[PDB]
Design a protein around this motif. Structure first.
Motif, PDB file in Angstrom:
ATOM      1  N   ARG A  92      66.149  11.388  37.618  1.00 20.14           N
ATOM      2  CA  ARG A  92      64.967  11.685  36.809  1.00 20.14           C
ATOM      3  C   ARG A  92      65.047  13.075  36.188  1.00 20.14           C
ATOM      4  NH1 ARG A  92      61.527  10.619  40.708  1.00 20.14           N
ATOM      5  NH2 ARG A  92      61.401  12.709  41.630  1.00 20.14           N
ATOM      6  N   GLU A 373      58.081  13.999  45.169  1.00 19.51           N
ATOM      7  CA  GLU A 373      57.315  12.762  45.006  1.00 19.51           C
ATOM      8  C   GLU A 373      57.697  11.717  46.047  1.00 19.51           C
ATOM      9  OE1 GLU A 373      55.941  11.422  41.020  1.00 19.51           O
ATOM     10  OE2 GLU A 373      57.742  12.501  40.348  1.00 19.51           O
ATOM     11  N   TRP A 403      48.360  15.955  40.273  1.00 21.20           N
ATOM     12  CA  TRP A 403      49.266  15.334  39.311  1.00 21.20           C
ATOM     13  C   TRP A 403      48.582  14.097  38.743  1.00 21.20           C
ATOM     14  CZ3 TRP A 403      54.295  15.893  42.682  1.00 21.20           C
ATOM     15  CH2 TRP A 403      54.765  17.203  42.537  1.00 21.20           C
ATOM     16  N   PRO A 406      52.013  12.417  34.354  1.00 22.63           N
ATOM     17  CA  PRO A 406      51.630  11.143  34.972  1.00 22.63           C
ATOM     18  C   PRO A 406      51.178  11.289  36.429  1.00 22.63           C
ATOM     19  CG  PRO A 406      53.981  11.374  35.089  1.00 22.63           C
ATOM     20  CD  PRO A 406      53.470  12.627  34.403  1.00 22.63           C
ATOM     21  N   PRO A 407      50.421  10.323  36.935  1.00 25.21           N
ATOM     22  CA  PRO A 407      50.064  10.344  38.354  1.00 25.21           C
ATOM     23  C   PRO A 407      51.297  10.133  39.221  1.00 25.21           C
ATOM     24  CG  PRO A 407      49.469   8.250  37.403  1.00 25.21           C
ATOM     25  CD  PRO A 407      49.882   9.133  36.251  1.00 25.21           C
TER      26      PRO A 407
HETATM   27  C1  LIG Z   1      53.927  18.545  36.758  1.00 24.33           C
HETATM   28  N1  LIG Z   1      54.631  17.574  37.579  1.00 24.33           N
HETATM   29  C2  LIG Z   1      55.829  17.895  38.348  1.00 24.33           C
HETATM   30  N2  LIG Z   1      56.136  16.625  39.009  1.00 24.33           N
HETATM   31  C3  LIG Z   1      57.281  16.429  39.913  1.00 24.33           C
HETATM   32  O1  LIG Z   1      57.957  17.660  40.107  1.00 24.33           O
HETATM   33  C4  LIG Z   1      59.307  17.558  39.585  1.00 24.33           C
HETATM   34  C5  LIG Z   1      59.709  18.866  38.948  1.00 24.33           C
HETATM   35  O2  LIG Z   1      58.970  19.039  37.711  1.00 24.33           O
HETATM   36  P1  LIG Z   1      59.338  20.260  36.737  1.00 24.33           P
HETATM   37  O3  LIG Z   1      58.567  20.120  35.466  1.00 24.33           O
HETATM   38  O4  LIG Z   1      60.822  20.413  36.667  1.00 24.33           O
HETATM   39  O5  LIG Z   1      58.743  21.506  37.551  1.00 24.33           O
HETATM   40  P2  LIG Z   1      57.279  21.785  38.156  1.00 24.33           P
HETATM   41  O6  LIG Z   1      57.074  20.752  39.236  1.00 24.33           O
HETATM   42  O7  LIG Z   1      57.312  23.194  38.696  1.00 24.33           O
HETATM   43  O8  LIG Z   1      56.324  21.619  36.998  1.00 24.33           O
HETATM   44  C6  LIG Z   1      59.269  16.342  38.651  1.00 24.33           C
HETATM   45  O9  LIG Z   1      60.567  15.812  38.404  1.00 24.33           O
HETATM   46  C7  LIG Z   1      58.313  15.427  39.389  1.00 24.33           C
HETATM   47  O10 LIG Z   1      58.950  14.823  40.492  1.00 24.33           O
HETATM   48  C8  LIG Z   1      55.211  15.658  38.644  1.00 24.33           C
HETATM   49  N3  LIG Z   1      55.205  14.378  39.059  1.00 24.33           N
HETATM   50  C9  LIG Z   1      54.219  13.658  38.557  1.00 24.33           C
HETATM   51  N4  LIG Z   1      54.095  12.370  38.889  1.00 24.33           N
HETATM   52  N5  LIG Z   1      53.289  14.162  37.688  1.00 24.33           N
HETATM   53  C10 LIG Z   1      53.237  15.474  37.222  1.00 24.33           C
HETATM   54  O11 LIG Z   1      52.354  15.830  36.446  1.00 24.33           O
HETATM   55  C11 LIG Z   1      54.287  16.231  37.762  1.00 24.33           C
END
Ligand SMILES: C[n+]1cn([C@@H]2O[C@H](COP(=O)(O)OP(=O)(O)O)[C@@H](O)[C@H]2O)c2nc(N)[nH]c(=O)c21
Ligand SMILES: Nc1ncnc2c1ncn2[C@@H]1O[C@H](CSCC[C@H](N)C(=O)O)[C@@H](O)[C@H]1O
Length: 467
Positions: A92, A373, A403, A406-407
């Protein structure tokens, strides 16, 4: 204060056979550190060579967590026996950064340059890799269209460039993904297989060390419920090794064979108390510095180099009887009883082992899981299994990111759980110093709801602590 190690547990478990982990030793921990560094380097090289990108930020760390949801292998840190081989987490994250990583934008000029950089990278991908004619013409159309607009005199805000980029990524993404999918799957599988080989070498080195110490590794019904207690190891630990300790500006510096690790004096004193409370094979603290060295190094290796505020833990304890953290380390724990990733080393400091292996029949718990996740989703499945399995009082108060777009399945499933008793969203602005919003979910069985009901007054006291 930073912790309250005086609070006794109310977690209740079936008594456990001692665990079969090989007892830790700095010589082995150093080897694991060196191999994990090489593994991160292999990951960097695969991402650069196969897709021309840096490894997505923090993706390796999240890969370690996702892998350990399913890993059946022999290493406490690195994966080696996982179905599926391909990590959906790493897949992913890499795919989201193809053909380029979308950086953070502050200036409209940086937004314009990123739009151009994406279009140019998408074209380079289409010109140089195997792609179907249909996907090639779609990406080519959209790229030339963005280029023609950029080369013209145009009018756009940074928001308009970002929306232009999002729309171009919307149009190109499915096609770019189909081009890169098999290559990215190969990165995920290869790094797993290198990890499994490193696990094999660490295991052989650790067994050889134990044999040199004349310690056997070849060594009953469990039918009582007991209040929880730290993970004990069945295999005798090897003798202490030479670890030197001195303090510099209130930093504990521990040296094993010229390899230094550091921890604050406050954390060091905490670990000494945790060890007094949790370790039963070392009454004269002869193995203490060896094990602190392994502990610090293990956690430095895990991350590559936050907790709820103390007033919130106080209110969780006073208002809801919480005594135990489902996700913690010896360094960040508030209570002296907790689950953690690494019982082989953390048990000496109070760990009850990893949470998915922890089977409480009773207790009042807090859970603030890592941002992973797959681990969060497995956590919820485990909550529902535990809550359905026991009629003794059981309560979990859970804090996860909001979150929504997406959820994430863990939050969705917790919101639909038959055990949900209360939920709220809390924004937080006071963050403790160490020298949007959080979803809070109450999952309780009937007995736990009767005992620790989320009444209006208790919720008000919890919110008063959560600034
Ligand atoms: C903001 N966000 C981050 N994740 C999870 O966190 C991982 C890393 O997300 P990122 O944007 O690389 O960094 P961040 O988490 O600091 O924003 C993603 O690949 C998802 O597994 C999220 N997973 C979901 N389902 N929804 C979100 O809004 C979301
Ligand atoms: N399988 C697992 N079981 C229990 N804890 C785990 C785990 N995998 C990772 N963790 C730990 O979960 C913690 C999340 S940070 C939690 C901070 C603090 N104890 C609090 O409750 O607010 C980290 O220390 C991380 O190492």
């Amino acid at each position: 204060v930073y912790w309250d190690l005086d609070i006794q547990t109310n977690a209740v478990i079936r008594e456990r056979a001692p665990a079969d982990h090989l007892p830790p030793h700095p010589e082995i921990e150093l080897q694991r550190a060196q191999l994990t560094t090489k593994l991160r380097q292999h990951y960097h090289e695969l991402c650069s060579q196969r897709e021309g990108i840096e490894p997505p930020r923090e993706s390796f760390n999240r890969w370690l967590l996702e892998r350990k949801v399913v890993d059946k292998g022999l290493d406490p840190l690195l994966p080696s026996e996982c179905d599926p081989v391909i990590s959906p987490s790493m897949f992913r994250e890499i795919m989201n950064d193809i053909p380029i990583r979308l950086s953070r934008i502050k200036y409209k000029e940086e937004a314009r340059k990123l739009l151009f950089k994406y279009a140019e990278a998408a074209k380079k991908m289409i010109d140089s890799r195997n792609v179907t004619p249909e996907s090639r013409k779609v990406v080519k159309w959209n790229v030339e269209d963005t280029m023609n607009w950029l080369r013209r005199d145009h009018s756009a805000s940074k928001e308009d460039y970002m929306d232009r980029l999002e729309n171009l990524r919307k149009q190109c993404g499915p096609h770019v993904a189909s081009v890169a999918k098999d290559s990215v799957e190969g990165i995920c599988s290869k790094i797993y297989h290198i990890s499994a080989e490193y696990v094999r070498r660490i295991r052989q080195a650790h067994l050889t060390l134990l044999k040199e110490c004349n310690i056997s590794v070849d060594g009953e019904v469990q039918d009582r419920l007991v209040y929880c207690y730290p993970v004990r190891l069945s295999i005798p630990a090897p003798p202490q090794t030479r670890v030197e300790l001195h303090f510099e500006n209130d930093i504990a510096c521990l040296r094993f064979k010229g390899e230094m690790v550091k921890v604050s004096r406050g954390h060091f004193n905490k670990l000494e108390l945790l060890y007094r409370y949790s370790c039963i094979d070392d009454p004269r603290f002869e193995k203490f510095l060896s094990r602190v060295w392994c502990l610090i190094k293990r956690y430095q290796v895990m991350f590559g180099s936050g907790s709820l505020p103390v007033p919130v833990f106080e209110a969780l304890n006073k208002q809801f009887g919480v005594t135990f953290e489902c996700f913690a380390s010896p360094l960040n724990c508030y209570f002296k009883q907790f689950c953690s990733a690494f019982p082989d080393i953390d048990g000496f400091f109070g760990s009850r082992g990893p949470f998915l292996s922890f089977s409480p029949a009773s207790g009042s718990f807090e859970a603030n899981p890592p941002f992973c996740e797959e681990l969060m989703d497995a956590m919820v499945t485990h909550f529902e299994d535990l809550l359905g399995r026991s009629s003794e009082p059981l309560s979990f108060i859970i804090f996860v990111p909001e979150w929504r777009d997406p959820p994430t399945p863990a939050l969705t499933r917790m919101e639909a759980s038959r055990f949900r008793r209360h939920q709220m969203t809390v924004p937080a602005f006071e963050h403790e110093y160490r020298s949007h919003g959080t979803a809070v979910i109450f999952l309780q069985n009937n007995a736990g709801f009767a005992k620790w009901e989320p009444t209006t007054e208790r919720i008000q006291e919890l919110l008063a602590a959560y600034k």
